[PDB]
């Protein structure tokens, strides 16, 4: 009907839509600006992370510069090297207990010092025997042990007429004939009984001795010989040789002593040859009456050229009464060639064998150099353990001022919370996007549409 | 046709004008010329209502027809004491409103013994009270008389006119206790 103001009130349509127009875009802008602020906060926090990484690196620099961080790597090998030093000092203990037996070794080998001195002492003492003093006390030319020999002949001979034997004493009788001097000391081993004898030939003259012996002040009681001085023949036993036999070697101070020797020693068959290293066949061919030949090397040993079928080393007394009839021109000095070789021999032995002494001395030098090296090894191991000791003494001590690491940790959880907030506002942006569009479309559609026929008056 | 399409000039200029004071922060000061010029542009353009209505001879008819009449000189000196009442009531002919006197003033309609919310006024009473303060409690009597027993006012509310003037005052006083106190609190934090 009447086309009148009825439609004027429709102008309110735009205001209703505007009411939500303001709200939707205001919320969208506010929350997206909040997201921008959150992102700026993320950037601010993130720009601190590299600086704090370099700051903890600077803490490590402080540790290195103050020697605080050195021992962290080392400790686990420091313990192993301490155990290595323990086993090395155990090896040192094994070596030193391998360096005392070397002292037992030196003691045992220098027992050769005793061995050589014992032999040399007696030999060197025999060097005294050229003159010293004579007669009543002549322990190597007219005596050997006891200071009573002269009185014996004037003692036991006092009642000679009661002897069942002619006699003058009897050791003063036996003497060596011409020949070669070094033959003197071999005969005593056999005839020692006749060099101190006083002969009787019945049980009672022999038994009176043990009683009357001590009456005149001598105690020696060496056994006695039984015989009667007389001379007899010795024909069919002598050897086929011209060089002197023991009968020729011994001088007939009393011819009855010739029969004494023939009886109690059977010396008539024996001969003498200067050295063992000599012909053999003459003795070996073995005709009848071939007999042994004697020999001497020194005052301490000799050899028997016993027909060649027998060769034996023989022993002689060190001290002997037998003496030769040689003149008194100069005595031993006429003979010193064959005495020096017997005494100077040991001097050569010690001079030459001192190389063995020098050899053991060099061994001792080697082992004591080893001892010195082991001592230096003990010192070196002590220094090596002391360096580990210094390393482990510090470890860290009081060298920690790193609470900036705790600061870093709280900043790390702070940035974690910041990222959580960033994600929450990421949810918020989606919420506003899905909330704005459904209402924004309604607004635009209504606003453009609801202008409509505005003032079509006519 | 060419008529009546220009009517919306004022209908939207009201919106153009009102929002400015609603947004310009009072923290910035200097009001007189910077409101007077732009508001006088309204009267300049409003003269053309009359001299653009053809003539149905210069612009007869008084210019006082503006509904935004009292919008003139609203902001100046209305800051600390928005209710700039004068100790006299019957001198409207002059156009200055602040002659030779000042003093103290009240602050509320009988709302709850608390300040103004929404005014109302009428020609017979020539005096203002609030909207809900005359209907909410009062209803129960179809018509009730002057606010106080045998007091000055005379009331007939069935045709009382809406009052859009005073609410412009409200927010400025309230926000002042915030912003300057916000400024003070900013100074307080500055010393901590």
């Amino acid at each position: 009907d009447a086309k009148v103001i009825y439609v004027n009130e429709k102008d309110s349509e735009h205001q209703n839509a505007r009411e939500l127009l303001r709200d939707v875009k205001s919320r969208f802008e506010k929350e997206k600006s909040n997201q921008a602020e959150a992102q700026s906060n993320i950037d601010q926090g993130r720009k601190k992370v590299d600086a704090l990484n370099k700051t903890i690196a600077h803490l490590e620099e402080e540790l290195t510069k103050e020697m605080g961080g050195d021992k962290d790597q080392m400790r686990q090998e420091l313990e192993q090297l301490e155990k290595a030093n323990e086993k090395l000092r155990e090896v040192n203990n094994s070596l030193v207990v391998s360096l005392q037996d070397v002292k037992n070794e030196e003691r045992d080998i220098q027992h050769e010092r005793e061995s050589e001195l014992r032999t040399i002492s007696r030999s060197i003492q025999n060097k005294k025997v050229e003159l010293q003093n004579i007669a009543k006390g002549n322990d190597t030319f007219l005596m050997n042990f006891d200071r009573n020999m002269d009185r014996l002949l004037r003692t036991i001979e006092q009642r000679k007429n009661e002897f069942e034997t002619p006699a003058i004493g009897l050791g003063s009788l036996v003497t060596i004939r011409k020949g070669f001097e070094k033959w003197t000391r071999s005969i005593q081993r056999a005839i020692s009984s006749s060099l101190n004898a006083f002969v009787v030939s019945n049980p009672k003259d022999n038994r009176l001795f043990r009683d009357i012996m001590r009456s005149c002040g001598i105690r020696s009681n060496i056994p006695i010989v039984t015989y009667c001085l007389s001379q007899f023949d010795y024909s069919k036993g002598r050897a086929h040789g011209n060089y002197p036999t023991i009968v020729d070697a011994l001088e007939f101070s009393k011819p009855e002593i010739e029969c004494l020797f023939v009886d109690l020693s059977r010396i008539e068959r024996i001969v003498l040859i200067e050295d063992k290293n000599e012909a053999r066949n003459f003795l070996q061919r073995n005709p009848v009456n071939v007999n042994m030949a004697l020999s001497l090397r020194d005052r301490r040993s000799g050899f028997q050229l016993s027909g060649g079928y027998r060769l034996d080393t023989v022993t002689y007394q060190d001290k002997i009464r037998l003496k030769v009839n040689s003149s008194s021109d100069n005595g031993t000095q006429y003979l010193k060639d064959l005495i020096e070789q017997e005494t100077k021999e040991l001097q050569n032995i010690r001079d030459r064998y001192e190389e063995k002494l020098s050899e053991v001395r060099s061994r001792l030098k080697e082992i004591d150099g080893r001892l010195k090296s082991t001592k230096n090894e003990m010192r070196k191991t002590n220094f090596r353990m002391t360096e580990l000791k210094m390393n482990v003494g510090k470890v860290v001590d009081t060298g920690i001022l790193n609470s900036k690491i705790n600061e870093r940790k709280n900043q790390e959880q702070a940035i974690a919370s910041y990222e959580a907030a960033k994600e929450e506002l990421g949810l918020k942006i989606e919420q506003i996007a899905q909330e704005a569009q459904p209402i924004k479309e309604q607004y635009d559609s209504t606003k453009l549409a609801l202008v409509e026929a505005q003032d079509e008056l006519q | 046709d060419l008529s009546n399409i220009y009517q919306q000039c004022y209908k939207q200029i009201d919106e153009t004008i009102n929002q400015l004071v609603d947004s310009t922060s009072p923290s910035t000061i200097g009001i007189e010329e910077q409101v007077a010029d732009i508001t006088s542009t309204y009267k300049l353009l409003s003269t053309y209502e009359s001299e653009s209505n053809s003539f149905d001879p210069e612009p007869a008819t008084m210019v006082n027809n503006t509904d935004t009449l009292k919008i003139l000189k609203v902001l100046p000196y209305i800051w600390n004491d928005p209710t700039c009442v004068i100790p006299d009531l019957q001198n409207p002919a002059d156009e200055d409103d602040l002659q030779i006197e000042g003093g103290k003033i009240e602050l509320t309609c009988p709302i709850t013994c608390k300040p103004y919310e929404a005014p109302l006024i009428s020609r017979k009473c020539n005096h203002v009270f609030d909207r809900d303060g005359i209907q909410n409690y009062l209803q129960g009597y179809t018509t009730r008389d002057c606010p106080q027993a045998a007091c000055s006012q005379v009331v007939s509310m069935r045709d009382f006119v809406r009052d859009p003037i005073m609410e412009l005052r409200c927010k400025i006083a309230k926000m002042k206790e915030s912003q300057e106190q916000d400024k003070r609190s900013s100074q307080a934090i500055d010393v901590l």
Partner: protein
């Protein structure tokens, strides 16, 4: 040309309407952010009052007077040098204790010799050591130490008789030298005429040796000699020395061993002018007789008065009496006992060494105890490691001072700058809206046109 464009009024009103629009919403849009920034300022106020409390809550424990200890590190150093000193003392102590332990082990090894030599004549045992009766018997010692290596010399020229013809004991070992003549006694026991010369190479140029022989050819095996020994003799050679066919076969015609009795009851030979009794061939029936060690020889001569000539010179012997056991009434110990008392001579220095190594062990234990006391002291001072941790607690709260100061500074910059930023962003907006309004203030110029120019 002229007015045909009445829509220009609307054309002009459009844009200025959109401008009366637009900026108004941006007003509040920009106004909004300052409130959230004020909320952040309130958060800052709360945080900084928390830091105000934290100042004292820290300072109560952030003394810095409880500083890393003044001289505890010097104590660490001195006690560590002390334990290295203890280690050195322990090294020296253990070296000396090992030396003394070896010293006592020296008696532990040599004590066998004094037990072995605890016999008559300074030694008699069934081991190699029996040959040490004379230093000059080094030749026999070396000979025996290598005789066993040969495939058959050990069984064809046997070791010295004391090992293979061993006598009962010292009382007969001395008799061994006469049982087998002294020269052969320290020689090797040849077995046959083939061992006579075949085996001279190993030893002849090194050690002394001798040889023996025998023969039995024509018609007469050995004649009786066993029971003619009726002179009061019952003991005999081949039993008191352990004879065997391995050894003594050849001695029947070389050493005349058929005349060596053994006597318990000594009787003098002086009661004899009877043994002149010849064997039926006119030669002496008796060749040699012995009592104790008074060996007497009998010989023959074929010239002169035919008188007999005995001799009493005999081998060495220790005693001649007619009693029983130990042979010595006046006193016991003799020169023989010096190498036995070598036991006491060892024991003296050995007890000294034992007590010396015992006090060395005392010192070792005391050094170990001192080192362990220093170690427990080291533990008691490493307990201070926790006292370093107050300095950790002191540092972390000290670091919290840095963090709270940094927070105050950064937030102060943050809030203050943002305050002015938002304020100026509002201010520029205050100018923009007013200039836009001024621009609008010229639009109405169009109103005077059109309606009447038309």
């Amino acid at each position: 040309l002229k007015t045909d464009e009445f829509l220009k009024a609307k054309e002009k009103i459009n844009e200025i309407f959109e401008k009366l629009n637009t900026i108004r919403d941006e007003v509040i849009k920009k106004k909004n952010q300052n409130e959230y920034y004020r909320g952040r300022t309130k958060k800052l106020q709360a945080t900084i009052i928390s830091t105000k409390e934290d100042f004292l809550r820290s300072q109560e424990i952030l003394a810095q007077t409880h500083l890393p200890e003044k001289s505890v590190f010097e104590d660490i150093d001195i006690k560590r040098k002390e334990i290295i000193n203890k280690e050195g003392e322990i090294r020296d102590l253990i070296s000396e204790i090992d030396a003394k332990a070896n010293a006592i082990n020296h008696e532990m090894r040599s004590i066998q010799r004094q037990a072995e030599s605890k016999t008559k004549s300074l030694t008699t045992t069934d081991k190699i050591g029996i040959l040490n009766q004379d230093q000059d018997l080094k030749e026999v010692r070396d000979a025996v130490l290598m005789v066993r290596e040969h495939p058959e010399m050990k069984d064809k020229i046997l070791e010295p008789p004391i090992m293979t013809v061993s006598a009962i004991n010292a009382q007969f070992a001395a008799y061994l030298a006469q049982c087998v003549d002294y020269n052969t006694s320290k020689a090797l026991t040849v077995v046959d005429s083939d061992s006579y010369k075949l085996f001279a190479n190993p030893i002849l140029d090194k050690f002394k040796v001798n040889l023996r022989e025998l023969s039995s050819a024509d018609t007469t095996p050995p004649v009786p000699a066993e029971t003619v020994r009726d002179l009061g003799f019952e003991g005999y050679l081949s039993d008191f020395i352990t004879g065997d066919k391995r050894v003594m076969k050849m001695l029947c015609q070389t050493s005349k061993i058929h005349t060596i009795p053994v006597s318990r009851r000594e009787l003098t030979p002086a009661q004899i002018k009877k043994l002149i009794t010849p064997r039926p061939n006119g030669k002496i029936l008796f060749k040699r007789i012995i009592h104790g060690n008074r060996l007497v020889d009998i010989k023959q001569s074929a010239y002169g008065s035919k008188q007999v000539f005995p001799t009493d010179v005999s081998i060495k012997q220790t005693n001649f009496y007619q009693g029983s056991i130990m042979s010595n009434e006046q006193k016991i110990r003799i020169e023989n006992e010096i190498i036995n008392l070598k036991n006491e001579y060892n024991d003296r220095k050995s007890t000294l060494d034992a007590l010396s190594n015992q006090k060395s062990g005392y010192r070792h234990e005391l050094s170990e105890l001192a080192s362990k006391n220093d170690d427990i002291n080291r533990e008691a001072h490493q307990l201070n490691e926790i006292r370093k941790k107050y300095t950790m607690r002191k540092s972390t709260i000290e670091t919290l001072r840095e963090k709270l100061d940094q927070l105050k500074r950064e937030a102060r910059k943050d809030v203050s700058q943002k305050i002015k930023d938002i304020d100026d962003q509002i201010q520029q907006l205050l100018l923009k809206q007013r200039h836009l309004l001024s621009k609008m203030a010229s639009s109405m110029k169009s109103l005077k046109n059109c309606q009447k120019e038309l």
